[PDB]
Design an enzyme around this catalytic site. Structure first.
Site, PDB file in Angstrom:
ATOM      1  N   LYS A  48     -12.644  -5.629  -5.288  1.00 14.46           N
ATOM      2  CA  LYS A  48     -11.791  -6.232  -6.289  1.00 14.46           C
ATOM      3  C   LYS A  48     -12.700  -7.181  -7.074  1.00 14.46           C
ATOM      4  O   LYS A  48     -13.262  -8.116  -6.507  1.00 14.46           O
ATOM      5  CB  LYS A  48     -10.746  -7.028  -5.520  1.00 14.46           C
ATOM      6  CG  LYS A  48      -9.585  -7.538  -6.262  1.00 14.46           C
ATOM      7  CD  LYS A  48      -8.867  -8.462  -5.350  1.00 14.46           C
ATOM      8  CE  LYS A  48      -7.668  -9.068  -6.006  1.00 14.46           C
ATOM      9  NZ  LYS A  48      -6.741  -7.978  -6.435  1.00 14.46           N
TER      10      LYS A  48
ATOM     11  N   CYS B  24     -14.330 -11.879 -12.738  1.00 20.41           N
ATOM     12  CA  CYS B  24     -15.175 -13.074 -12.813  1.00 20.41           C
ATOM     13  C   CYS B  24     -14.328 -14.311 -13.013  1.00 20.41           C
ATOM     14  O   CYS B  24     -13.207 -14.202 -13.548  1.00 20.41           O
ATOM     15  CB  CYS B  24     -16.191 -12.962 -13.925  1.00 20.41           C
ATOM     16  SG  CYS B  24     -17.436 -14.229 -13.748  1.00 20.41           S
TER      17      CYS B  24
ATOM     18  N   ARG C 119       0.119  -9.165   5.973  1.00 18.14           N
ATOM     19  CA  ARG C 119       1.442  -8.743   5.546  1.00 18.14           C
ATOM     20  C   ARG C 119       1.729  -7.343   6.079  1.00 18.14           C
ATOM     21  O   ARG C 119       0.861  -6.672   6.642  1.00 18.14           O
ATOM     22  CB  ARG C 119       1.557  -8.748   4.028  1.00 18.14           C
ATOM     23  CG  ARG C 119       1.533 -10.119   3.344  1.00 18.14           C
ATOM     24  CD  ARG C 119       1.259  -9.989   1.826  1.00 18.14           C
ATOM     25  NE  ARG C 119       2.386  -9.473   1.053  1.00 18.14           N
ATOM     26  CZ  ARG C 119       2.290  -8.741  -0.057  1.00 18.14           C
ATOM     27  NH1 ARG C 119       1.099  -8.422  -0.553  1.00 18.14           N
ATOM     28  NH2 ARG C 119       3.384  -8.279  -0.642  1.00 18.14           N
TER      29      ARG C 119
ATOM     30  N   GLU D  64     -15.324 -12.709 -20.193  1.00 24.30           N
ATOM     31  CA  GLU D  64     -14.119 -13.180 -20.866  1.00 24.30           C
ATOM     32  C   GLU D  64     -13.967 -12.549 -22.246  1.00 24.30           C
ATOM     33  O   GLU D  64     -12.942 -11.955 -22.555  1.00 24.30           O
ATOM     34  CB  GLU D  64     -14.170 -14.713 -20.990  1.00 24.30           C
ATOM     35  CG  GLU D  64     -13.314 -15.311 -22.087  1.00 24.30           C
ATOM     36  CD  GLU D  64     -13.385 -16.842 -22.145  1.00 24.30           C
ATOM     37  OE1 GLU D  64     -12.736 -17.527 -21.306  1.00 24.30           O
ATOM     38  OE2 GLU D  64     -14.050 -17.353 -23.076  1.00 24.30           O
TER      39      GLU D  64
ATOM     40  N   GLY E 234       0.774  -1.218   0.000  1.00 19.79           N
ATOM     41  CA  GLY E 234       0.000   0.000   0.000  1.00 19.79           C
ATOM     42  C   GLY E 234       0.803   1.264   0.000  1.00 19.79           C
ATOM     43  O   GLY E 234       0.459   2.244   0.673  1.00 19.79           O
TER      44      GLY E 234
ATOM     45  N   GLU F 281      -9.796  -8.117 -14.614  1.00 24.57           N
ATOM     46  CA  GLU F 281     -10.158  -7.474 -13.356  1.00 24.57           C
ATOM     47  C   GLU F 281     -10.611  -6.013 -13.502  1.00 24.57           C
ATOM     48  O   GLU F 281     -10.220  -5.283 -14.450  1.00 24.57           O
ATOM     49  CB  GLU F 281      -8.971  -7.546 -12.387  1.00 24.57           C
ATOM     50  CG  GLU F 281      -9.308  -7.240 -10.927  1.00 24.57           C
ATOM     51  CD  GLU F 281      -8.103  -6.813 -10.128  1.00 24.57           C
ATOM     52  OE1 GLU F 281      -7.481  -7.643  -9.444  1.00 24.57           O
ATOM     53  OE2 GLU F 281      -7.790  -5.616 -10.188  1.00 24.57           O
TER      54      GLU F 281
HETATM   55  N1  LIG Z   1      -8.346 -11.849   5.290  1.00 24.69           N
HETATM   56  C1  LIG Z   1      -7.410 -11.001   4.814  1.00 24.69           C
HETATM   57  N2  LIG Z   1      -7.290  -9.851   5.435  1.00 24.69           N
HETATM   58  C2  LIG Z   1      -6.518  -8.955   4.952  1.00 24.69           C
HETATM   59  N3  LIG Z   1      -5.749  -8.936   3.907  1.00 24.69           N
HETATM   60  C3  LIG Z   1      -5.842 -10.122   3.298  1.00 24.69           C
HETATM   61  C4  LIG Z   1      -6.627 -11.196   3.628  1.00 24.69           C
HETATM   62  N4  LIG Z   1      -6.463 -12.279   2.686  1.00 24.69           N
HETATM   63  C5  LIG Z   1      -5.498 -11.694   1.793  1.00 24.69           C
HETATM   64  N5  LIG Z   1      -5.139 -10.440   2.185  1.00 24.69           N
HETATM   65  C6  LIG Z   1      -4.111  -9.550   1.694  1.00 24.69           C
HETATM   66  O1  LIG Z   1      -4.549  -8.998   0.474  1.00 24.69           O
HETATM   67  C7  LIG Z   1      -3.320  -8.584  -0.091  1.00 24.69           C
HETATM   68  C8  LIG Z   1      -3.528  -8.777  -1.503  1.00 24.69           C
HETATM   69  S1  LIG Z   1      -2.537  -7.652  -2.403  1.00 24.69           S
HETATM   70  C9  LIG Z   1      -3.285  -6.106  -1.868  1.00 24.69           C
HETATM   71  C10 LIG Z   1      -2.416  -4.943  -2.337  1.00 24.69           C
HETATM   72  C11 LIG Z   1      -2.705  -3.549  -1.740  1.00 24.69           C
HETATM   73  N6  LIG Z   1      -4.086  -3.148  -1.994  1.00 24.69           N
HETATM   74  C12 LIG Z   1      -1.724  -2.506  -2.317  1.00 24.69           C
HETATM   75  O2  LIG Z   1      -2.024  -1.300  -2.174  1.00 24.69           O
HETATM   76  O3  LIG Z   1      -0.604  -2.887  -2.735  1.00 24.69           O
HETATM   77  C13 LIG Z   1      -2.237  -9.348   0.470  1.00 24.69           C
HETATM   78  O4  LIG Z   1      -1.313  -8.547   1.237  1.00 24.69           O
HETATM   79  C14 LIG Z   1      -2.892 -10.231   1.389  1.00 24.69           C
HETATM   80  O5  LIG Z   1      -2.139 -10.487   2.615  1.00 24.69           O
END
Ligand SMILES: Nc1ncnc2c1ncn2[C@@H]1O[C@H](CSCC[C@H](N)C(=O)O)[C@@H](O)[C@H]1O
Ligand SMILES: C[n+]1cn([C@@H]2O[C@H](COP(=O)(O)OP(=O)(O)O)[C@@H](O)[C@H]2O)c2nc(N)[nH]c(=O)c21
EC number: 2.1.1.57
Length: 291
Positions: free
Chosen positions: A169, A172, A97, A227, A72, A201
């Site tokens: 996000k 399909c 993360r 698609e 982020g 997406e």
């Molecule tokens: N239950 C959950 N809660 C929070 N984040 C989750 C999740 N399952 C997946 N994710 C997170 O969703 C992320 C997908 S990538 C998201 C990227 C972010 N929006 C950006 O600005 O770069 C990953 O970091 C992953 O850990």
């Protein structure tokens, strides 16, 4: 050269006026041309969505709950933009993360290192209370099984967090990998410029009026349509050079981007929209360290 004159770009999935049989070979084709394209894609779209809210009088005073926010890096520019405009907003960024350190030390943004579950959403809902919420979810687990499970969680986010608007996000699953018809929230299918070359997406943007929640079924026939329209866009459209687009970059994506940017609000006044856009683009490219 693949040139052309266009009036405006396809802002929403419903505007795409043509389809193409998907060619599996496109998977092998270069997915990105720009550095940090991911953060670019994410930021223009998230800037577009939020400006709307501002336009509608629902952003100011809201708490933005972003799920799936790490790293982020782009969120930081977003945070500053509204903060500099004087819009009050609290950001609550959650991910298992870690977040880009540039996010730290800002009192109005709270980072949380937690993979959210339905239970968690309930506590964060109790603790946010009574602030109005704007939800942004970009969570990722992939298999249709993975997808459904994600779409399911996003739906439990809205039902528990009960937001005033949301951006989800949306991709399909693939018809040849269908499992079952499911429901997604009704919202506008926002097309994302600078999304990977063959990305199907987009971002579901919804504004919640009343105490109602309108959903919509997604069936395989729908998956076939998604698609074909997304493949024509990606293959044909996006590779268009808008020769009647007077701009430093006439490639479609910048033409498409100009359109989301011309809706963004600034403090500095410009004689023309070309100026504000050149300005915000430059600003964002510089922020992202994109040449
Ligand atoms: N239950 C959950 N809660 C929070 N984040 C989750 C999740 N399952 C997946 N994710 C997170 O969703 C992320 C997908 S990538 C998201 C990227 C972010 N929006 C950006 O600005 O770069 C990953 O970091 C992953 O850990
Ligand atoms: N687009 C991409 N794929 C497959 O998706 C795989 C991953 O690429 P992706 O779809 O760009 O990943 P993402 O959507 O998770 O970000 C590719 O290797 C292709 O096999 C696709 N498969 C089908 N059936 N239809 C499509 O329109 C399509």
């Amino acid at each position: 050269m693949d040139v052309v004159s266009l009036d405006k770009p396809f802002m929403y999935f419903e505007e795409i006026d043509n389809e193409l049989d998907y060619e599996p070979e496109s998977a092998n084709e270069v997915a990105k041309k720009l550095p940090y394209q991911g953060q670019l894609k994410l930021l223009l779209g998230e800037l577009f969505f939020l400006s709307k809210l501002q336009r509608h009088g629902i952003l100011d005073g809201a708490t933005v709950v972003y799920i799936g926010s790490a790293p982020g890096t782009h969120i930081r520019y977003l945070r500053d933009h509204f903060y500099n405009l004087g819009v009050i907003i609290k950001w609550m960024l959650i991910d298992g993360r870690h977040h880009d350190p540039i996010l730290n030390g800002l009192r109005d943004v709270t980072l949380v290192t937690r993979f959210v579950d339905e239970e968690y959403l309930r506590s964060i809902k109790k603790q946010l209370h009574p602030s109005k919420i704007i939800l942004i979810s970009d969570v990722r687990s992939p298999s249709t099984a993975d997808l459904l499970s994600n779409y399911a969680l996003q739906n439990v986010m809205i039902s528990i967090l009960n937001p005033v608007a949301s951006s989800l996000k949306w991709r399909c699953p693939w018809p040849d990998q269908w499992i079952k018809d499911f429901y997604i929230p009704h919202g506008n299918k926002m097309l994302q410029p600078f999304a990977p070359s063959y990305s199907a997406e987009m971002r579901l943007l919804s504004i919640y009026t009343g105490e109602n929640m309108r959903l919509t079924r997604v069936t395989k026939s729908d998956a076939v349509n998604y698609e074909k329209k997304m493949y024509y866009l990606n293959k044909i459209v996006r590779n268009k050079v808008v020769v009647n687009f007077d701009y430093p970059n006439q490639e479609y994506d910048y033409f498409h981007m100009y359109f989301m940017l011309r809706t963004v609000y600034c403090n500095k006044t410009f004689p023309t929209t070309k100026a504000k856009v050149l300005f915000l683009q430059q600003s964002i490219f510089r922020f992202l360290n994109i040449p």
